[PDB]
Amino acid sequence: QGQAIKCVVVGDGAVGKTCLLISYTTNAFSGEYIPTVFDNYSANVMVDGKPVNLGLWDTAGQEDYDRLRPLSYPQTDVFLICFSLVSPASFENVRAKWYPEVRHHCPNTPIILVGTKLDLRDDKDTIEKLKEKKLTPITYPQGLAMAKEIGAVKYLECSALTQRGLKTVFDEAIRAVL
Ligand SMILES: Nc1nc2c(ncn2[C@@H]2O[C@H](COP(=O)(O)OP(=O)(O)NP(=O)(O)O)[C@@H](O)[C@H]2O)c(=O)[nH]1
Ligand SMILES: [Mg+2]
């Protein structure tokens, strides 16, 4: 058996919460966007000698669930607050929406700030798409700054598609607890 660890995942509609978990636990990725209502995944992981039943709770980013979402929060060992490195709108909500909601229900429980979609921050298609609307993809130093600002215990960037940065997200989610 292994040590139970409840990891809860929050952030804007479409940032890649779900994809990030599917990609970690099954190495699978979909182009398709099927919005989460609520889901639950598991992963027996081996980190630094010790073994762990990582529980992972995938929450709906959509505001409709603002009322129902914090039912997930009691007894959480660590949170992942997720933002797309490619939607600065999803970025500001980290201190606007996601850090207040979490600390409101769980004021002590560690946070790991997660910049998702790392594979698109260098994409011409996507840099150009934003250029139009006065926009900048979120850089590492800016992400790091946001993390410091919310007392995130780590800042970590990833892509569920390439899987660049992927395993370190969960390795560190487990590390915020042990
Ligand atoms: N290029 C790229 N696209 C990604 C990545 N992760 C997710 N996406 C895409 O982003 C969209 C949203 O993914 P999804 O995981 O469903 O987001 P979510 O935040 O879980 N959704 P919700 O909050 O509504 O449940 C999909 O088109 C998905 O394929 C990534 O690492 N790279
Ligand atoms: Mg989801």
Short mmCIF file of C-alpha atoms and ligand atoms in Angstrom, two decimals:
data_model
loop_
_atom_site.label_atom_id
_atom_site.label_comp_id
_atom_site.label_asym_id
_atom_site.label_seq_id
_atom_site.Cartn_x
_atom_site.Cartn_y
_atom_site.Cartn_z
CA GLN A 1 0.00 0.00 0.00
CA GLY A 2 0.95 3.71 0.06
CA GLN A 3 0.45 7.04 1.83
CA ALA A 4 -2.82 8.79 0.85
CA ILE A 5 -2.39 12.34 -0.48
CA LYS A 6 -5.34 14.40 -1.64
CA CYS A 7 -4.38 16.82 -4.40
CA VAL A 8 -6.99 19.23 -5.62
CA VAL A 9 -6.70 21.01 -8.99
CA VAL A 10 -8.24 24.40 -9.69
CA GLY A 11 -8.25 27.23 -12.28
CA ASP A 12 -9.97 28.84 -15.28
CA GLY A 13 -12.24 27.05 -17.70
CA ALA A 14 -10.02 25.40 -20.34
CA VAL A 15 -6.59 25.97 -18.82
CA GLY A 16 -5.75 22.23 -19.08
CA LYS A 17 -6.50 20.86 -15.61
CA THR A 18 -8.09 17.64 -16.96
CA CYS A 19 -5.57 17.10 -19.84
CA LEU A 20 -2.76 17.50 -17.36
CA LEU A 21 -4.06 14.60 -15.20
CA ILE A 22 -4.97 12.31 -18.12
CA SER A 23 -1.52 12.91 -19.57
CA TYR A 24 0.16 12.13 -16.22
CA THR A 25 -1.78 8.96 -15.38
CA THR A 26 -2.32 7.55 -18.87
CA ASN A 27 0.08 9.46 -21.18
CA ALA A 28 -3.03 10.35 -23.22
CA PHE A 29 -4.01 13.68 -24.71
CA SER A 30 -7.11 14.95 -26.51
CA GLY A 31 -7.45 17.94 -28.88
CA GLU A 32 -11.17 17.84 -27.88
CA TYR A 33 -12.43 20.07 -25.04
CA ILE A 34 -14.98 18.28 -22.87
CA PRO A 35 -15.58 20.55 -19.81
CA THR A 36 -15.18 18.91 -16.38
CA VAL A 37 -18.18 18.65 -14.09
CA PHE A 38 -16.22 16.73 -11.42
CA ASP A 39 -13.72 13.84 -11.78
CA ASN A 40 -11.32 11.82 -9.69
CA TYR A 41 -8.04 10.08 -10.68
CA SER A 42 -5.48 8.04 -8.77
CA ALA A 43 -1.76 7.35 -9.14
CA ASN A 44 0.53 5.14 -7.06
CA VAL A 45 3.83 7.07 -7.31
CA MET A 46 7.38 6.40 -6.06
CA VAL A 47 9.15 9.60 -4.92
CA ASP A 48 12.43 9.75 -2.94
CA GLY A 49 12.17 6.17 -1.63
CA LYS A 50 8.68 6.58 -0.09
CA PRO A 51 5.47 5.33 -1.98
CA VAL A 52 2.21 7.30 -2.30
CA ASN A 53 -1.44 6.89 -3.28
CA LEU A 54 -1.84 10.28 -4.86
CA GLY A 55 -5.52 11.17 -4.96
CA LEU A 56 -6.26 13.81 -7.60
CA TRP A 57 -9.51 15.77 -7.74
CA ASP A 58 -10.30 17.50 -11.07
CA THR A 59 -12.57 20.51 -10.50
CA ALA A 60 -14.68 22.49 -12.97
CA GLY A 61 -13.09 25.83 -13.92
CA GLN A 62 -16.41 27.29 -15.08
CA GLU A 63 -18.00 29.86 -12.74
CA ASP A 64 -21.33 27.92 -12.65
CA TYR A 65 -19.70 25.63 -10.13
CA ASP A 66 -18.38 28.40 -7.89
CA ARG A 67 -20.97 27.28 -5.36
CA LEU A 68 -20.36 23.55 -5.63
CA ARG A 69 -16.59 23.51 -6.07
CA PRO A 70 -15.40 24.04 -2.45
CA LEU A 71 -17.10 20.79 -1.43
CA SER A 72 -13.88 19.25 -2.78
CA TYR A 73 -11.64 21.20 -0.43
CA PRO A 74 -11.88 19.77 3.13
CA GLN A 75 -8.83 17.61 4.06
CA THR A 76 -6.76 18.65 1.03
CA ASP A 77 -3.06 17.93 1.39
CA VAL A 78 -1.91 20.28 -1.42
CA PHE A 79 -3.53 22.34 -4.20
CA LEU A 80 -2.55 23.03 -7.73
CA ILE A 81 -3.62 26.36 -8.98
CA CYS A 82 -3.44 26.19 -12.74
CA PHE A 83 -3.16 28.86 -15.36
CA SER A 84 -2.49 28.74 -19.08
CA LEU A 85 0.84 30.34 -19.97
CA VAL A 86 -1.11 31.59 -23.03
CA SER A 87 -4.14 33.29 -21.40
CA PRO A 88 -3.01 36.25 -19.22
CA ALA A 89 -6.72 36.48 -18.29
CA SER A 90 -6.34 33.07 -16.62
CA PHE A 91 -3.20 34.47 -15.00
CA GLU A 92 -4.70 37.47 -13.13
CA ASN A 93 -7.49 35.24 -11.74
CA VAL A 94 -4.82 33.37 -9.79
CA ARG A 95 -4.82 36.19 -7.19
CA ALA A 96 -8.27 37.50 -8.20
CA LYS A 97 -10.25 34.28 -7.97
CA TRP A 98 -8.21 31.18 -7.24
CA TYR A 99 -5.95 32.17 -4.30
CA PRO A 100 -8.85 33.79 -2.43
CA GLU A 101 -11.27 30.84 -2.96
CA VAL A 102 -8.67 28.30 -1.79
CA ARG A 103 -7.28 30.20 1.20
CA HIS A 104 -10.88 31.03 2.18
CA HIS A 105 -11.60 27.32 2.77
CA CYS A 106 -8.03 26.05 3.26
CA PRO A 107 -5.83 28.78 4.76
CA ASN A 108 -2.76 26.61 5.61
CA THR A 109 -2.67 23.94 2.89
CA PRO A 110 0.28 24.31 0.44
CA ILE A 111 -0.18 25.73 -3.06
CA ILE A 112 1.80 24.95 -6.18
CA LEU A 113 1.27 27.38 -9.02
CA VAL A 114 1.20 25.64 -12.38
CA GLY A 115 1.68 27.24 -15.77
CA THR A 116 0.15 24.87 -18.27
CA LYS A 117 0.39 24.82 -22.08
CA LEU A 118 4.18 25.37 -22.07
CA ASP A 119 4.33 24.04 -25.65
CA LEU A 120 2.47 27.06 -27.07
CA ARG A 121 4.44 29.91 -25.52
CA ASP A 122 6.93 29.71 -28.43
CA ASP A 123 4.30 29.00 -31.13
CA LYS A 124 4.18 31.62 -33.90
CA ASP A 125 0.48 30.81 -34.45
CA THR A 126 -0.24 31.49 -30.76
CA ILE A 127 2.14 34.45 -30.19
CA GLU A 128 0.58 36.12 -33.27
CA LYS A 129 -2.96 35.29 -32.08
CA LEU A 130 -2.30 37.28 -28.92
CA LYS A 131 -0.25 40.05 -30.50
CA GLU A 132 -3.53 41.20 -32.11
CA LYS A 133 -5.39 41.65 -28.79
CA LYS A 134 -2.52 43.67 -27.08
CA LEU A 135 -1.22 40.48 -25.50
CA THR A 136 1.86 38.74 -24.01
CA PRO A 137 2.21 35.03 -23.17
CA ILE A 138 3.22 34.61 -19.49
CA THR A 139 7.00 34.39 -18.97
CA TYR A 140 8.73 32.32 -16.29
CA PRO A 141 9.81 35.42 -14.21
CA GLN A 142 6.22 36.77 -14.25
CA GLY A 143 4.87 33.33 -13.30
CA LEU A 144 7.46 33.06 -10.54
CA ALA A 145 6.48 36.56 -9.35
CA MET A 146 2.75 35.60 -9.17
CA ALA A 147 3.68 32.51 -7.14
CA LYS A 148 5.71 34.56 -4.65
CA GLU A 149 2.76 36.95 -4.41
CA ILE A 150 0.40 34.12 -3.40
CA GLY A 151 2.92 32.27 -1.20
CA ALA A 152 2.82 29.32 -3.62
CA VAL A 153 5.31 26.79 -2.28
CA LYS A 154 6.70 26.19 -5.83
CA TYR A 155 6.21 27.52 -9.32
CA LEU A 156 6.26 24.88 -12.11
CA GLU A 157 5.63 25.07 -15.85
CA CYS A 158 4.33 22.24 -18.03
CA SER A 159 2.64 20.93 -21.16
CA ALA A 160 0.24 18.00 -21.01
CA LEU A 161 0.78 17.62 -24.81
CA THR A 162 4.61 17.33 -24.97
CA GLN A 163 4.71 16.24 -21.30
CA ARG A 164 7.54 18.74 -20.74
CA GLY A 165 7.58 19.60 -17.01
CA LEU A 166 4.79 17.11 -16.33
CA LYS A 167 6.19 14.65 -13.82
CA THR A 168 7.89 17.41 -11.78
CA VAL A 169 4.47 18.96 -11.12
CA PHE A 170 3.37 15.90 -9.16
CA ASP A 171 6.75 15.09 -7.73
CA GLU A 172 6.56 18.57 -6.17
CA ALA A 173 2.87 18.25 -5.22
CA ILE A 174 3.89 15.23 -3.24
CA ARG A 175 6.93 17.15 -1.87
CA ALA A 176 4.81 20.01 -0.46
CA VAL A 177 3.32 17.41 1.91
CA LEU A 178 6.04 14.88 2.99
N1 LIG B 1 -1.32 22.83 -26.84
C1 LIG B 1 -1.84 22.37 -25.69
N2 LIG B 1 -3.15 22.33 -25.52
C2 LIG B 1 -3.51 21.83 -24.30
C3 LIG B 1 -2.68 21.40 -23.26
N3 LIG B 1 -3.42 20.97 -22.17
C4 LIG B 1 -4.65 21.14 -22.55
N4 LIG B 1 -4.79 21.67 -23.83
C5 LIG B 1 -6.03 21.97 -24.56
O1 LIG B 1 -6.73 22.98 -23.88
C6 LIG B 1 -8.15 22.69 -23.93
C7 LIG B 1 -8.72 22.56 -22.52
O2 LIG B 1 -8.21 21.38 -21.82
P1 LIG B 1 -8.92 20.88 -20.49
O3 LIG B 1 -7.97 19.92 -19.86
O4 LIG B 1 -10.21 20.26 -20.89
O5 LIG B 1 -9.11 22.13 -19.59
P2 LIG B 1 -9.76 22.18 -18.18
O6 LIG B 1 -9.24 23.39 -17.46
O7 LIG B 1 -9.59 20.82 -17.56
N5 LIG B 1 -11.34 22.37 -18.39
P3 LIG B 1 -12.47 22.63 -17.28
O8 LIG B 1 -12.03 23.67 -16.26
O9 LIG B 1 -13.60 23.38 -17.97
O10 LIG B 1 -12.79 21.24 -16.77
C8 LIG B 1 -8.29 21.47 -24.85
O11 LIG B 1 -8.39 21.87 -26.24
C9 LIG B 1 -6.97 20.78 -24.59
O12 LIG B 1 -6.56 19.87 -25.59
C10 LIG B 1 -1.29 21.47 -23.45
O13 LIG B 1 -0.43 21.14 -22.64
N6 LIG B 1 -0.94 21.96 -24.71
MG MG B 2 -11.39 19.96 -16.20
#
